[PDB]
Amino acid sequence: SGFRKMAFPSGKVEGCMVQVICGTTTLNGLWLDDVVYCPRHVICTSEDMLNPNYEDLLIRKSNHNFLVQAGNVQLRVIGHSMQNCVLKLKVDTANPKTPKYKFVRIQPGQTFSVLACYNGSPSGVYQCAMRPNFTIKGSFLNGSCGSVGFNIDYDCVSFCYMHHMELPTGVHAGTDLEGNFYGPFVDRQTAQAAGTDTTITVNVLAWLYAAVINGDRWFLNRFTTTLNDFNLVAMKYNYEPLTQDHVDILGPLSAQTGIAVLDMCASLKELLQNGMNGRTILGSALLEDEFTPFDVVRQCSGVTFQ
Amino acid sequence: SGFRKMAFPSGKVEGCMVQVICGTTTLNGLWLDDVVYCPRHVICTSEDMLNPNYEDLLIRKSNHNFLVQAGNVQLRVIGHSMQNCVLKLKVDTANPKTPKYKFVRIQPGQTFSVLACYNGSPSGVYQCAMRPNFTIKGSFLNGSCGSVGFNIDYDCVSFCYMHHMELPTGVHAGTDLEGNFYGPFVDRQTAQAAGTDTTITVNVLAWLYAAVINGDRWFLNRFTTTLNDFNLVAMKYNYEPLTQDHVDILGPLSAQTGIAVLDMCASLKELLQNGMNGRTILGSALLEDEFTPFDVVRQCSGVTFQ
Numbered sequence: 001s002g003f004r005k006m007a008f009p010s011g012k013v014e015g016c017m018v019q020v021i022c023g024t025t026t027l028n029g030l031w032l033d034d035v036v037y038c039p040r041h042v043i044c045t046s047e048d049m050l051n052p053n054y055e056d057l058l059i060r061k062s063n064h065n066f067l068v069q070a071g072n073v074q075l076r077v078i079g080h081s082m083q084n085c086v087l088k089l090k091v092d093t094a095n096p097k098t099p100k101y102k103f104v105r106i107q108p109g110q111t112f113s114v115l116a117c118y119n120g121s122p123s124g125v126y127q128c129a130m131r132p133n134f135t136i137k138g139s140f141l142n143g144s145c146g147s148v149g150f151n152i153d154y155d156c157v158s159f160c161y162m163h164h165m166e167l168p169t170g171v172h173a174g175t176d177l178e179g180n181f182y183g184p185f186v187d188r189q190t191a192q193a194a195g196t197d198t199t200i201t202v203n204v205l206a207w208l209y210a211a212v213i214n215g216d217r218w219f220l221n222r223f224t225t226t227l228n229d230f231n232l233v234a235m236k237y238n239y240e241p242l243t244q245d246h247v248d249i250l251g252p253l254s255a256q257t258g259i260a261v262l263d264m265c266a267s268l269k270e271l272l273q274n275g276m277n278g279r280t281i282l283g284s285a286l287l288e289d290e291f292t293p294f295d296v297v298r299q300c301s302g303v304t305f306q
Numbered sequence: 307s308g309f310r311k312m313a314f315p316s317g318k319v320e321g322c323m324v325q326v327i328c329g330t331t332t333l334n335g336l337w338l339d340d341v342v343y344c345p346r347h348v349i350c351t352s353e354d355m356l357n358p359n360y361e362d363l364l365i366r367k368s369n370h371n372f373l374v375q376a377g378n379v380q381l382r383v384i385g386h387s388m389q390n391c392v393l394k395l396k397v398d399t400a401n402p403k404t405p406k407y408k409f410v411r412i413q414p415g416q417t418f419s420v421l422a423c424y425n426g427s428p429s430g431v432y433q434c435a436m437r438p439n440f441t442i443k444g445s446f447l448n449g450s451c452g453s454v455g456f457n458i459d460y461d462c463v464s465f466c467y468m469h470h471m472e473l474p475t476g477v478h479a480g481t482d483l484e485g486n487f488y489g490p491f492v493d494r495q496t497a498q499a500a501g502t503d504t505t506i507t508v509n510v511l512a513w514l515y516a517a518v519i520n521g522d523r524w525f526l527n528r529f530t531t532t533l534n535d536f537n538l539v540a541m542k543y544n545y546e547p548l549t550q551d552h553v554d555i556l557g558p559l560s561a562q563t564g565i566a567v568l569d570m571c572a573s574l575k576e577l578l579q580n581g582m583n584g585r586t587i588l589g590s591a592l593l594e595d596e597f598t599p600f601d602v603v604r605q606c607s608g609v610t611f612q
Contacts, residue, residue: 001476004445006422006430011317071612116312121610124312125431137589139310141608170307170521215476283443285591302447304427306377 003210003282005290007113007125008152009305015097018075019120020089020146021067028117028146029068029089030159030177032098036068036075036089037177038146039164040082041187049189058082069120070095085164085187086179099157103177106160108132109200109240111292112149114161119143129203129290130161132240133195134183135171138163148177152305167192200289201239202246205264207288209253210296211281218279220259223266230265237272249293256300309516309588311596313419313431314458315611321403324381325426326395326452327373334423334452335374335395336465336483338404342374342381342395343483344452345470346388347493355495364388375426376401391470391493392485405463409483412466414438415506415546417598418455420467425449435509435596436467438546439501440489441477444469454483458611473498506595507545508552511570513594515559516602517587524585526565529572536571543578555599562606 020029020038024045029038041049043057061080066089068075079090106112108130116123116139128136128149140147140163149161164174164187171194173185185192212220231241247261254261268287276285326335326344330351335344347355349363367386372395374381385396412418414436422429422445434442434455446453446469455467470480470493477500479491491498518526537547553567560567574593582591 001447001472002443002445002478004432005311006432006445007313009317009320009421009428009431010315011320011428014315014317115315118608118610121612122315122317123608123610124605125315126310126312137308139308139312139605141307141606143608166307172308280592286586299430299445300447302424302429302449304424304429306427 001214003214003299005127006299007127008150010113010115010122010125012099012152012157012306013115013148013150014122016095016099017115017117017120017122018068018070021069022061022065026119027143028120030146030148030162031068031070031075031091031095032101034091034094036077036091037162038087038089039162039175039187040085040087040179041145041164042087052188054082054187058087071120084179085175085181086162086177100155101157101159104151104158104160105176105178105180106130108134109203109292110160111290111295112151112160114138114149114163115147116140116144117147127290128161129200130182131171132198132200134185135167135173135194135197136161138172140166140172149174154305167194169194196238199237199239199287201234201242201268202249202293203289203291204239204268204287205242205246205250205261206253206293206296207282207291208264208268209250209257209259209293210291210300212257212259213300214282216281219267219271219281221267221270223270224260224263225266225269226262227265230262230269233269233272239272252297253293307520309520309605311433312605313433314456316419316421316428316431318405318458318463318612319421319454319456320428322401322405323421323423323426323428324374324376327375328367328371332425333449334426334454336452336454336468337374337376337381337397337401338407340397340400342383342397343468344393344395345468345481345493346391346393346485347451347470348393358494360388360493364393377426390485391481391487392468392483406461407463407465410457410464410466411482411484411486412436414440415509415598416466417596417601418457418466420444420455420469421453422446422450423453433596434467435506436488437477438504438506440491441473441479441500441503442467444478446472446478455480460611473500475500502544505543505545505593507540507548507574508555508599509595509597510545510574510593511548511552511556511567512559512599512602513588513597514570514574515556515563515565515599516597516606518563518565519606520588522587525573525577525587527573527576529576530566530569531572531575532568533571536568536575539575539578545578558603559599
């Protein structure tokens with residue numbers, strides 16, 4: 001029993017993290033097969049970041065200007081190319097520790113594990129949700145750029161995030177591993193609006209299910225609701241509209257607990273309208289939205305990897 | 307910027323986790339050098355757990371009754387001994403993936419990373435505090451026994467916890483790697499009182515410092531206090547008494563922020579007496595006590611491993 005926000009074991013990703021140096025700039029890179037992926041702003045100075053012309057800045061760089069190191073072993077760059085906002089450095093050596101992997105563009109509301117790195121060295125691991133507004137609320141200090149987010153199913157590591165920047169508001173923005181930013185953001189040191197961050201309703205419901213399974217039941221009421229009625233309430237408190245797809249994803253959890261989804265919606269509605277009145281749920285005084293239905297099932301069943 | 311509850315990278319520990327089978331019982335073991343460590347209740351059946359005589363139950367076991375497997379590779383047990391509540395299985399092969407390591411008995415209030423395992427396979431990683439009452443609030447399903455807690459400094463993994471049991475109250479109890487239980491607990495399926503769980507005051511203060519560093523400053527007041535005055539309040543809300551040792555540990559954080567420890571105590575005192583009035587600190591609606599002063603410094607500075 002018990003319910004914790006836990007990350008995937010990071011070992012498989014630890015073996016892929018490298019240090020990338022170009023001029024004065026040092027950040028983290030991801031070494032898979034004979035290719036190293038990193039933020040293209042590795043080529044920028046502090047001044048360049050204000051208004052970079054990446055094509056022109058990269059022209060001034062050759063293969064030998066990129067220094068790649070995996071702890072102690074030196075990697076020779078034998079080719080470089082820019083794919084969107086990522087730089088692909090072709091190296092002479094295939095990573096012997098390359099896991100089975102995919103590149104995945106995740107949807108907003110989905111979760112992943114971040115391996116926070118500095119100077120190519122892993123610092124720590126934690127879970128994140130991709131916010132509806134395509135930001136993340138991580139822990140990223142100077143030099144953390146190129147740190148990656150991932151999910152692990154069985155053998156396969158699915159990379160979904162590379163960290164690029166912190167916005168003036170202190171939230172975090174980045175790309176998929178094809179170098180396409182999540183959200184409207186660009187790799188320029190400028191003012192960038194994230195937009196209204198809504199709560200991931202389906203995740204909150206999944207977490208309420210997790211609570212019931214672990215014996216926190218006080219918030220269960222004798223009321224029910226409709227999708228329309230509920231969504232009217234959702235809109236007021238800046239919650240994502242709940243769809244039938246969402247209802248279907250929660251089906252296994254409703255089946256385990258014997259609580260219909262719309263009954264659980266009615267509980268959430270009261271929590272939103274009345275608050276918690278000093279009580280807590282799974283050790284939290286607010287409604288948690290960083291667990292997907294999958295995360296709850298995975299943890300309540302105890303799925304392992306490799 | 308940003309502040310997250312993050313675990314140590316688990317790769318070094320992943321390579322040490324094995325499956326231990328004795329009869330019908332399967333749980334996790336820790337393979338270091340040519341010795342495998344596991345909970346001694348591996349030898350128990352469900353019935354045995356009610357009132358086990360471990361010496362007598364172990365007599366009925368020989369080396370060949372212990373099946374140890376590291377993924378696919380079979381380990382031959384060439385010796386077994388019981389050390390307190392742990393079983394030390396001598397195997398024929400030294401773990402090639404044995405990291406530099408120590409065994410450490412941590413103090414209450416200290417934190418560590420748990421690698422949750424099932425069938426010898428890592429499931430996930432999260433941070434825990436050893437509660438003042440020597441319990442932990444983890445996420446441990448059936449088969450998770452033998453999962454370990456650790457800290458990593460640079461090269462060295464310091465193992466501090468092995469999971470043994472869940473109490474009827476749903477909290478978790480276990481041993482150091484010498485097999486001595488933290489707290490008054492025993493490896494018997496019986497009723498066991500944990501005792502009053504107090505809040506780790508020094509950790510709450512460290513976290514308040516973390517908040518200030520990240521720009522959450524609303525709770526800073528124009529008041530101050532004494533240790534005695536503060537501790538009078540602490541006692542009322544079941545907080546650990548704050549000592550001068552605690553004050554000294556917080557010194558670096560007071561120096562960074564320019565907020566005296568006793569001034570920060572005065573803020574905490576008001577928070578305890580008035581609550582948060584609907585506001586949050588570092589995304590929490592309650593006071594967090596699972597970050598040590600070390601954890602805050604580590605994360606605010608960005609210390610890496612290997």
